Amino acid sequence: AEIYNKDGNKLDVYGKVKAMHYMSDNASKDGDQSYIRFGFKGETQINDQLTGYGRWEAEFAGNKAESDTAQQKTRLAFAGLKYKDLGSFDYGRNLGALYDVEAWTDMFPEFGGDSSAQTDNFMTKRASGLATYRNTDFFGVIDGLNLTLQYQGKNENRDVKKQNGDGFGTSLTYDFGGSDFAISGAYTNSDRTNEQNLQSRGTGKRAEAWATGLKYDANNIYLATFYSETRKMTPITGGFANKTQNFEAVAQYQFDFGLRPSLGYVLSKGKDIEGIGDEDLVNYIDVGATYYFNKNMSAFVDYKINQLDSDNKLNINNDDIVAVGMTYQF
Amino acid sequence: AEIYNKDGNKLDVYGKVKAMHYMSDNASKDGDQSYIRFGFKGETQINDQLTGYGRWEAEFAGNKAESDTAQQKTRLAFAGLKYKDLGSFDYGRNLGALYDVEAWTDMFPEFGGDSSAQTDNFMTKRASGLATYRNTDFFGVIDGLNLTLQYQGKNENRDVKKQNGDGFGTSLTYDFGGSDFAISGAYTNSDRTNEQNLQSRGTGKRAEAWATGLKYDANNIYLATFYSETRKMTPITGGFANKTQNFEAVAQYQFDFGLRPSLGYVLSKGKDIEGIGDEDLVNYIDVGATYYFNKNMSAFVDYKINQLDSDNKLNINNDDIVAVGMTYQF
Amino acid sequence: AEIYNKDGNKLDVYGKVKAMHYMSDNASKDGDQSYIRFGFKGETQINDQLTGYGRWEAEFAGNKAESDTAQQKTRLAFAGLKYKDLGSFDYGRNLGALYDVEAWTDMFPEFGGDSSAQTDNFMTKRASGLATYRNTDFFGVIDGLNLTLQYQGKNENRDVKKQNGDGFGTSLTYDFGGSDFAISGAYTNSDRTNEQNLQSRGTGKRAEAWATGLKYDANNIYLATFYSETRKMTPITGGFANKTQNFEAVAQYQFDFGLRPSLGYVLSKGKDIEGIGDEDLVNYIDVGATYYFNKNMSAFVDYKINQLDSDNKLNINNDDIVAVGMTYQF
Incomplete structure (x- = not known):
């Protein structure tokens, strides 16, 4: 406000x-x-x-x-x-x-x-x-395109999961629409900090990640999805994952009255882990909805349907969760 | 504001x-x-x-x-x-x-x-x-009556004093007044959390409490008082008190100029404690006053006259305290 | 705002x-x-x-x-x-x-x-x-003079560096100006807290400090400087410094466009230290500038040129620092 x-x-x-x-x-x-x-x-x-x-x-x-x-x-x-x-x-x-x-x-x-x-x-x-x-x-009319260059200073005070060396990131986005349509990709190569390479997993030299996304947001529908890959960045109980592939998807519909159902799915898949092979890092379906009373007040229910297994080599947690709530905001 | x-x-x-x-x-x-x-x-x-x-x-x-x-x-x-x-x-x-x-x-x-x-x-x-x-x-005109039902989810992250299981609470209040008059009572039965029953004192099953209060707030006088009893809820140096009885009273007068004297007394009495018998938990007279310069600025002096003894079986603190201050608020 | x-x-x-x-x-x-x-x-x-x-x-x-x-x-x-x-x-x-x-x-x-x-x-x-x-x-027209008496209650919860006993402080300031001119001095004698005198350095009884400052702030120039001495107050790696002498100076010019260069120098000199003799506590030249885009937005560069030596008996840090930034404020 x-x-x-x-x-x-x-x-x-x-x-x-x-x-x-x-x-x-x-x-x-x-x-x-x-x-x-x-x-x-x-x-x-x-x-x-x-x-x-x-x-x-x-x-x-x-x-x-x-x-x-x-x-x-x-x-x-x-x-x-x-x-x-x-x-x-x-x-x-x-x-x-x-x-x-x-x-x-x-x-x-x-x-x-x-x-x-x-x-x-x-x-x-x-x-x-x-x-x-x-x-x-x-600068001069590629209207729709959008650009980002970013530099991140080293951060090594913090916990070893939380640290990083100096790095760089681009992404771009071009939009369009009779209604609405966009595609996006980004790039990171931040080198890893020295103290971090005294770890069991994903030891190395540089830490990259890249992604791609497509969205559709028009006449009340919203759909979007993206792939991503990381090399030695995602934290793992052993130590940072050597590689990963991650995929997200989302379908949502907003009714005139206020209800807004959402479907989405989240998959993160550990790859070449340094003692465990490949276990998945995240695997669940999300079903839920918020009801918008207005700009300010709302209420929701969400349901994470964990799709991850029990014999999980990284001893993660196969347990569902159901969140319920109201959100006041100004 | x-x-x-x-x-x-x-x-x-x-x-x-x-x-x-x-x-x-x-x-x-x-x-x-x-x-x-x-x-x-x-x-x-x-x-x-x-x-x-x-x-x-x-x-x-x-x-x-x-x-x-x-x-x-x-x-x-x-x-x-x-x-x-x-x-x-x-x-x-x-x-x-x-x-x-x-x-x-x-x-x-x-x-x-x-x-x-x-x-x-x-x-x-x-x-x-x-x-x-x-x-x-x-809903339909018992004007004056007022009702509360409440449920409290279990809270067992926290310290063992601070924890609790799922529970429930009612209270009601009916007001009246040619000037102003009200009576009130409430009820709690929250069961105790498992980790808490690995304690020395007040071990058990459920934790209840109940209270009663009468107030009079009219043509500048304010008087109020209440009794309360707890079964295995109040924290004790040994462990939660098996039972207690607590009594509070308050007389206050607000002058036209701004001064507002207060008298009050606080008694909390430990009962059936699991190795110490009954020592009192709180016993003091409070004498004090704030001066309201206006809605916003004020200043006060308070004096807790601890009435608790020295040979106090729960080794509490018989020491008086005198608080002095000004309060800005907006 | x-x-x-x-x-x-x-x-x-x-x-x-x-x-x-x-x-x-x-x-x-x-x-x-x-x-x-x-x-x-x-x-x-x-x-x-x-x-x-x-x-x-x-x-x-x-x-x-x-x-x-x-x-x-x-x-x-x-x-x-x-x-x-x-x-x-x-x-x-x-x-x-x-x-x-x-x-x-x-x-x-x-x-x-x-x-x-x-x-x-x-x-x-x-x-x-x-x-x-x-x-x-x-009260009655010495216009320009300005007076402060202050009392500080004892603070002994905190760390031993951070503690103090009850104390007192005066300072006064007289201003003048065809453009602008002022001189200032202050006094402190806070006694030291008991737990603090279980230390290696600057043990004692009372902790005093005093200072003096001259400033000139007119038609866009700003210059100011001050001396200060402390007896057993300034924290030292061994323990509080027995005495110190500290000197600060500042010359700054504000251009019409927005740039505001600053020169300043900071010297703090340990004296009679209880096992190390006298090492300096702070010695650097500061060169830098902010650019005031307006009341709200600004950007700066500062450069501490540490002037302290390497063979520093209190094993302090001879390393330069260069701060760069923008400041939004409302």
Whole structure:
């Protein structure tokens, strides 16, 4: 909600209470997982052609006792400039380049974005240390095309899963539509940090990933799907997976009254693992729906139908989960 | 302060800096205990008869070095709907059912709400995992009556004091007044979680509590009092108290100029403790006052006169405390 | 940004995303150190002569993984009253008295305020437990003079570096100007806490500090400088420094277009250290500049030229650092 629009500055305070319960056995555990979001975002307008902005998004736990003050964590912190027509540059906590792809099917009521996309995993989902250029429609009219170059500074304070060396990411998108249609691909080659190569699995030199996505979003239908492959990036109980192939798909329909059913499927498949062969990393069908009471209030049910087996060589968790909830947001 | 009231949505950003000092010896320790509160709350109006809301309240420490980033904790997170006349349903971090009672005398400048009401202690004070129905005036005119049914999902991540199994809570309230008068009672039976019954004290099967309160709030006087009993819920240095009886009372007068004296007394009495017999759990007189400069600014002094003895079988703390402070709030 | 100015109350929500990168070796480390600030501040007006306020400022990390929820910390929490002409009293997390001095040259793009001023170091920089009276222009016209008396309650929960006993602080400032001119001095004598005197270095009885500053801020030039001395307050790897002498200087020029170069130098010199003699504690030249796009958006480069030696008896860090960034703020 735009709480300030004065003298060339627009403050926008946003947020969401997601009261939310998981009923299930202990895969991604069960019981309450409600949370609150909070964020501002400014846009100061320097000149009629230039603009600057900062965005901040934190996330505060809903489910802990108040004695567990290990409760908030930030999601987005950046601030940058955008010139009329030349595009936008920014730095700070942001979204890697491959997620320009993987977002196409990250629309479930709750589950999903679960495959190749780990958070604080080099440029795959959210990420620290990112300079980002994004050009749009291409300088002089390839209208529709959209471009991103990004650099990520090394991050080796953190846990060994969470670390990375200096790297790079592109992606592009061309849109069209009598109604609406788009295709997308991205590229990452971030080298791996030294301390990480003292590990059991996926040891090596560089860490790449690439993806491709097709979407269709028109006259209330939404469909999207993408493939992705990673070489030594995805974290594995042994150590980072040598390779993986991941596939996501999504079909959703929004009724006029408010109901919005979603179907989607998530597969992540471990490959050439350094002592276990190939076990799958993620395999479930998602069935669910939210009901949009309006822009602000909503309620949902989601059902992860884990499709993974019991004899699972990486001793993962074959347990279904059913999330139910209402989401107020302003 | 209602910072947004547009297109059927009212954002209300609130908060309070309580700069506050305890002078005392080390019972609930001494020195600074100032804190800050911050919360929004929305109310989107779907239709002329329905409404939805979310409330969030965190609490950020005032007193630590900045090197002790163990500093914030959330108090309320929920979001729900309310239909004209049928009442309100919500889920998330909220207030148990017995606190519909114990609030009657939780009005001191600082101390109190200290008896049967522990925070993250099954539905006794604040609490995680709560679905809550509250009906008011009873559907068709018992005007004055007010009703609450609540369910609390199991919470066993947390510390053993802090855990609980699935449970239930009712309370009701009928109001009246030529000026103002009300009576209240509530009920809880949450079963105890398995890991908790590996304890020394108050082991068992179910954990109940019940309370009763009378209040009088009219032409500037305010008086209220309540009894409460718990079976294996209140945390004890040995382990949860087998039973307890707790009594609170409060007399307060608000002058026209701004001064508001308060008298109150708090007694919590351990019963059938599993190795110590019965020691009291809380016994103090509270004398104090706030001066309301206005809606926003205020200042106070409170004085807990601990009435507990020295030879205290549960080795509690007989030490007085005197809190002084000013409270800005918006 | 003043988001509320109604019925005698002005809420002011502020904040800043400082996306920011250090390139360097590991002195104050290297890579991302962007952060976000957030604060409100109220001012309720009781009567035409009196006013009350609260200020709160937290600071949330930009650079950690979201798995390291050790991320926010508060900077300012207080709330007080100010009477027309008699001055202002407040309590809570605030700025000691010596910092009324040391602020004169704490203006770099990033570095500086680094000498005698440690945060949560008795009244030297930010600080917990502070009652503060500040009188201004002196009751009856010494216009220009400005006065501060402050008391700091003991703080012994915290780490031994971070602790302190009860203490006191004055400072005064007289301003003038055909353009602008001022001189300042402050005094602290906080006794040291008992647990702290079980240390190797700077053991003793009382902890004093004093400072002096001259500034010149006119027709776009800004120059300022100050001396400071501490007896057993500044933390040393062995233990608190017995004495120190610290000197800061700053020359800055603001062009009409927006560029604002800064020169400054920081020296902190350990004296009579209890096993090491005298090594310097801080010695660097700072060269840098911010470009102010406007009130809100800006970008900078700073360069700490560490001037400290390698054979450094307190095994400190002779490594340069170069900070680059943009700052959005509202």
